[PDB]
Every structure is written in structure tokens, then in C-alpha cells.
Write a protein that binds this ligand. Structure first.
Ligand SMILES: *Cc1c(COP(=O)(O)O)cnc(C)c1O
Ligand SMILES: *Cc1c(COP(=O)(O)O)cnc(C)c1O
Lengths: 396, 396
């Protein structure tokens, strides 16, 4: 059976952790994957989730299976964080969320649902985008098409071109948007542009799939959901795949959510029973620890208040590092003006480096970036800021 | 998009938990799903996993992502438990295991792999079998076909007929077998019959998929793996989907394993890089808590010794209840001889009840069984043994 099976290409993001850990040169710098690090270069588990894990250890009685859709308290808090305290989707029983194994689990379950229960042929994804989008939809059966986004010269969102390529997206097609913190560019639309986009979507009949992985890392939790909320107010149907791996630092417990909205409660519930049938034939029900922890923190005032400060601290450290990277690049030789990275939101930096410059930085200096030029800013500390800036100058 | 989507049929096993929890009659009896209960009717979290969770709380530093395949120590212990201390597959670097979200996650990842990377068209499943088998393979793309198993009159495995229906399974087809504790019959082959089956498989060129959910609940951990070990010794290629939800009482943390074996290390590794590519486009990597706990218990001598006693206690309670169910059924009116259930291994009892008798028991008396006649013996305690036996007699 297995004789002619060729090896698969390494994952562009995930494959770097392999090489990084096989390196054995003492001064290497990882900069690759979107995991946060502190001034010390470590990824600590948050104080607020430790407090919650202690609680759960003292307070659980059973490990018996969860429902297909997971914990109810989890699903209701997720809806509030995304849609608003007193929203109409919530009050009209127009939304249902299932707890998933991470945001990728949420994206596959949506893909599986639409493939089986809809007439969707195409999903539209931005150029550039998270590399694994194309792979989750292709395994479900769906064609991936691209819409222009970001012009490289002026380091801006090229709005007129995003309109003009989406003009050939048919009524019925899926269109993925990033809620906030575009991966990999870090360039999101203004609220005025999101308005212009909510409009058009309704004029043309596209189904919006919103992807959230970084809510809280751009301006704040509420401020970052205003593009999704501008769309909710105009739409009858929407699906959103959400993740809590980044803003809760719960990367390996696999906590996310796939939330479905339709016109009324009867229609969302008919649809949701199909979504649960797709879940049952993949894993059977969701992992409990991670989501049990989110709900506990979100349900307690003391623990919620501590969490939001911990996340405010991470957003601010990343901002300090963004400017330091730019000031240092200029002090050490940079032949280009890299001011434009101060204008991007999130963990990343679409630096502009060519694939050969990225390949060299790795080979000769051991600093690890993705071959697109994306570098994780939250990987940078005061102590490794001069080494890696020097290393870039040499390769320019 | 969602307007004409009909509702899905309720899950035959999972849908009973809904009805049971909506019932509000004080004396109901659940008996449906394969979750163990103690003399008190509760499902406690094991002492040995509590000790391990305490340890992990004290001793973790980070929640940063795991590898696509999960924890190495987890995968190596899983291989020993299944194949043997000093086995040749282990020594010849012929097996690779990935950590999955439960045994169902393990079955889907195998289905996905074979669909994408092989020429498999058919999977052969026993009649009867776990109801959700057909659903995981159909979502992957594969046809499910059935082989005879178990004759209802003599309450035995009908070996000659299992041979004769499998005679039309072609070279290249998958054939699922249950390692031990057949769900739902509780009837496994003798070691002599497993030998006869290992033989034939090699003569005909079928790829064996072994499913394990109950290792340890039939005779003991080592004794229950001897059919799989009889097959390993003859085969070049095998895949096994394993679960730790039942024998570790870790039902909602979602811990399993999908282990691939091929002829040599180069071939297993080429094949395994494809299996990891299917994992990346489903969830991205596995949930850590559950598997971190299995590995900790399996790695410590004190905690391992406590675990094996906890599992010996569960196997024995289920055995006490099997006999009590039979002695009581006869004392209260049973018009049939139900001795045959003392001859079955595992949590269950394929009682023989008709779907209308099962539907009545529920409606009128509130005892919940699956519509096939399967009842969970581990749900029975000394205190609810007389109520439910009476309730069956009334319906006979
Ligand atoms: C991190 C990330 C994901 C994956 O989320 P998980 O919660 O780890 O599954 C998906 N998409 C984007 C853009 C991400 O940054
Ligand atoms: C329990 C069970 C499964 C599911 O295992 P999980 O580990 O819960 O995913 C699959 N097949 C059979 C026969 C089972 O009994």
C-alpha cells in the first residue's frame, strides 16, 4: 500500500520549528511562528489561567464526555466577546456556537458543513494570507480563489483593487476576511472601508466567513470586533471561526469556536444540527481543559480583570519592540526606510525581504523568518535586538 | 444559503443523553452510552489522573504548541502497550504514532490519509458494529461494506460466515477489526481464530485497520492485545486507532493515537509525513492536557501501579454486575434464559430486545438502552438492579 507514497513538502511555518531545534549554534533567533515571548524570551503560562487550573483541580468531579458542541457557558461568552453585550443576534436567538479544537478546527468544521449542506464551490482568500487556509478548504473539497490586498510599494491596503478582483466573485461564493490583525501583512481596513464592504456583500450575495485569531492585539477587545459587528447588522447569514490560542496563551490546549448565524432561530437550529453531524464524524466532541479555563476566567470578575491586564501588557510589549526594531535598523546601517512597520497591527512584520535574503539570514546568521518575509516582532527582546538588526543589514 | 437545510437525524447513542437529561421523572436509568459508573452511580475522575494533574500544575512552564504528531513519550509508551516491550516493529523503527483528539480523531485521520494517498475504495466493517464507523469513512470519501459476525440464535461468533462474506473483499480493501471487547456484541475471536485470520489477510492482500477502545477491560492489558500482536508478526503494513477515553476515564480531554506501520523505517516515515499533512489541515496539532496526563502516569512507577489497580477494580465491578443482572432477571420473572450475557467481554450487553421493546422500556419505565438492544452493564448498581429487571420482564 505505502510503497509509492512520496513525502509531503514541509509546512512553511511549522517546519521552521524543526530546523530551529536542530540548529545547535548558540546565538540563533527564532522570529518565525506567531507565539508571544516576554522580555526574557520565554512563553510563560498566564497567571490568570494558572489560578483557573488550580480551581478546576479542586473542583471537578468527572471527566465524562461533553456535548458535540461543548460547554454552553463557553459558547455564550464567545458570542458576547464577538457581537456585543446587548446585540440583536443574541437577543433574537439567531446565533449558535460549537466549541472546536482551535481556530483551525473551527475552519475545517465550517468547510465540512458548507461542502455537505450547501452549494458552495468557491472560497475567496486574500493575497497574501495564512498559508494553511488553502489547505483546509481543499481537503473539504472547495476551490480557493484570491482577491488582491496590500500594495507592496506604498505599504498599504490597495482598496480599489480588492474591490475589482472581488467583482468576479459570484452570488453564493464564500469570502474569508481577517477580523483584525491581518496575517501576514498586519494591515486591516478602516471602519469606513468595512462599511463599504458590508454594503457590497449584501448587493452581491456573498456568504462572509470571518476569521479571528488575534482579537485584542490591535486596539482592544471591543474595538477589534467592529468590522464583524458592521457586517452583522446587515447580514442575515454569517459564519465566524474564532481562536483563543494567542490572547489566552493557550496554544496547546486547542480552544476555539465556530459560530453560525442565520435569519431566525429555527433556521440556525436546523443548520446547526448538520454542523454537529459533521463534528461527530471528525473528532467526537471537544477537549475540555482549555475551554473550561476560558469560561472560568471570563466568568469570574477578579480573574477577568487580571486576564485583560495580562493581554494589555503583551500588546504594549509588542508595540515597544516595533519601534525599537525600526530605530535600531536605522542606527546600524539600514539602507532603506522601514518606518512603515510602525503602522501595522499585531504580532508580525511583513518586512519586505526577498526569499533569498530570508534563506541567507538563516543559513549564515541563524535568524529564522518565514520565506514570505514575515517576522514575529513578539520574538524580539532588548537583548536580541542588536544581533538580528546587524544580521539584516548584511543581507540588504 | 441556509433556507433549505433539513435537520439531521439524532445520533443513536449521543441523542439519548439529551432525552435522558430532559426526562424529569425521578427514577430514570441511563444504561445507554459506554461510560463507566461506580457502586454509587457516579463517574469519578481516577485518583491516579488527579495526582498527575496536580504535578502538571506545579510543573509546567509553557502552553506553547505541540508538534503535529504530539508528545514523543506519549507515542512511544502507546507503542509498547499495544505491541510489546521488546517487539520487532519497535526495534526496527517500523512504526510511527501521532497523538489524536480521541479514538474517533484517530479513525478520521487514517480515513483521510488513505483517501488522499492510496487507492483504497472500500472499508469492510462487521455487522453489527460501532454506529459511527460508517459515518467517519463516508465523510472521507470511502465506501463501507459489511462482513457477517455473530449469530443471534446461539449467541456466538459465526466464524464460517465471517470467512464467507470476506471472501468477496478484494486485494487492496481495508478491513476494520475490533481488538478486544466487540462493540456492540462483546464477542471477540479466540487466539486460534485470530491466527486463522492473520493468515488469510496475508493470502488475500487486505490492509488491516485495528480499533482499540477497551484495552484492559476483557482479560488484562497484555492479554487483550494478542490478536493485534498475532497480526503484526505476519504483516508488513497495518494501521491501528487507539483510545484512552475509557480505561483512563479521560472521556472529555480527548486522548488517542493513530499508529501507522510499514515495511521499513524509510517507508513509514515517507507515509507519516503525509499523515501529518492531513492532520495540519483538520485541527493543527493535538490537545495537551489529556495526553500529558497519560504519559505522566505511564512514566512513574507509583502512579502506574495505582492506575492498573483502578482499572482492575472497574473490570471486576462490571463482572459482578453481569452475573447479578442474570440472577436477578431469573428471580423476577424472565421467561428467557439470559445466561449468554455472562459469556461477553466489556462494558456492554447485547440483550436481544426488539426495537419496540427498547422504545417501550424508555417511554413507560424510563430505562434508556440503545435501539439495537445494547445496554451498558457498568451503568448497573446493586441499588438499581431490581427496578430495571422488573421493567424488562414487563416488556418481554
Ligand atoms: C494562529 C492562527 C490560526 C490557528 O489557530 P489555532 O487556534 O492555533 O488553531 C489560524 N489562522 C490564523 C491567521 C492564525 O494566526
Ligand atoms: C468509545 C469508542 C470510540 C470513541 O473513542 P473516543 O476516544 O471517545 O474518540 C470509538 N469506537 C468505539 C468502538 C468506542 O467504544
Amino acid at each position: 500500500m505505502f510503497e509509492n507514497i512520496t513525502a509531503a513538502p514541509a509546512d512553511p511555518i511549522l517546519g521552521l520549528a524543526d530546523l530551529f531545534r536542530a540548529d545547535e549554534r548558540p546565538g540563533k533567533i527564532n522570529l518565525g511562528i506567531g507565539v508571544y515571548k516576554d522580555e526574557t524570551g520565554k512563553t510563560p503560562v498566564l497567571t490568570s489561567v494558572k489560578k483557573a487550573e488550580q480551581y478546576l483541580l479542586e473542583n471537578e468531579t468527572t471527566k465524562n464526555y461533553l456535548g458535540i458542541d461543548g460547554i454552553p457557558e463557553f459558547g455564550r461568552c464567545t458570542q458576547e466577546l464577538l457581537f456585543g453585550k446587548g446585540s440583536a443576534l443574541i437577543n433574537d436567538k439567531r446565533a449558535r456556537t460549537a466549541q472546536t479544537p482551535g481556530g483551525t478546527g473551527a475552519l475545517r468544521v465550517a468547510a465540512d458543513f458548507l461542502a455537505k449542506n450547501t452549494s458552495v464551490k468557491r472560497v475567496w482568500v486574500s493575497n497574501p494570507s495564512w498559508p494553511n487556509h488553502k489547505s483546509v478548504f481543499n481537503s473539504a473539497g472547495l476551490e480557493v480563489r484570491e482577491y488582491a490586498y496590500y500594495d507592496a510599494e506604498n505599504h498599504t491596503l490597495d482598496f480599489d483593487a480588492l474591490i475589482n478582483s472581488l467583482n468576479e466573485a459570484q452570488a453564493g461564493d464564500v469570502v474569508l476576511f481577517h477580523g483584525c490583525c491581518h496575517n501576514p501583512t498586519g494591515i486591516d481596513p478602516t471602519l469606513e472601508q468595512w462599511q463599504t464592504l458590508a454594503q457590497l456583500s449584501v448587493e452581491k450575495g456573498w456568504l462572509p466567513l470571518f476569521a479571528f485569531a488575534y482579537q485584542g492585539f490591535a486596539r482592544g477587545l471591543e474595538e477589534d470586533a467592529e468590522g464583524l459587528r458592521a457586517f452583522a447588522a446587515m447580514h442575515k447569514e454569517l459564519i465566524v471561526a474564532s481562536s483563543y490560542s494567542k490572547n489566552f496563551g493557550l496554544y496547546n490546549e486547542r480552544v476555539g469556536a465556530c459560530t453560525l448565524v442565520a435569519a431566525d432561530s429555527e433556521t440556525v437550529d436546523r443548520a446547526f444540527s448538520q454542523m454537529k453531524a459533521a463534528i461527530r464524524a471528525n473528532y467526537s466532541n471537544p477537549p475540555a481543559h482549555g475551554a473550561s479555563v476560558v469560561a472560568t476566567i471570563l466568568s469570574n470578575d477578579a480573574l477577568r480583570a487580571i486576564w485583560e491586564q495580562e493581554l494589555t501588557d503583551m500588546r504594549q510589549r509588542i508595540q515597544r519592540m516595533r519601534q525599537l526594531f525600526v530605530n535600531t535598523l536605522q542606527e546600524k546601517g539600514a539602507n532603506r526606510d522601514f518606518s512603515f512597520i510602525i503602522k501595522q497591527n499585531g504580532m508580525f512584520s511583513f518586512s519586505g525581504l526577498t526569499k533569498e535574503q530570508v534563506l541567507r539570514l538563516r543559513e549564515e546568521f541563524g535568524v529564522y523568518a518565514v520565506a514570505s518575509g514575515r517576522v514575529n516582532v513578539a520574538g524580539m527582546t532588548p537583548d536580541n535586538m542588536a544581533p538580528l538588526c546587524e544580521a539584516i543589514v548584511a543581507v540588504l
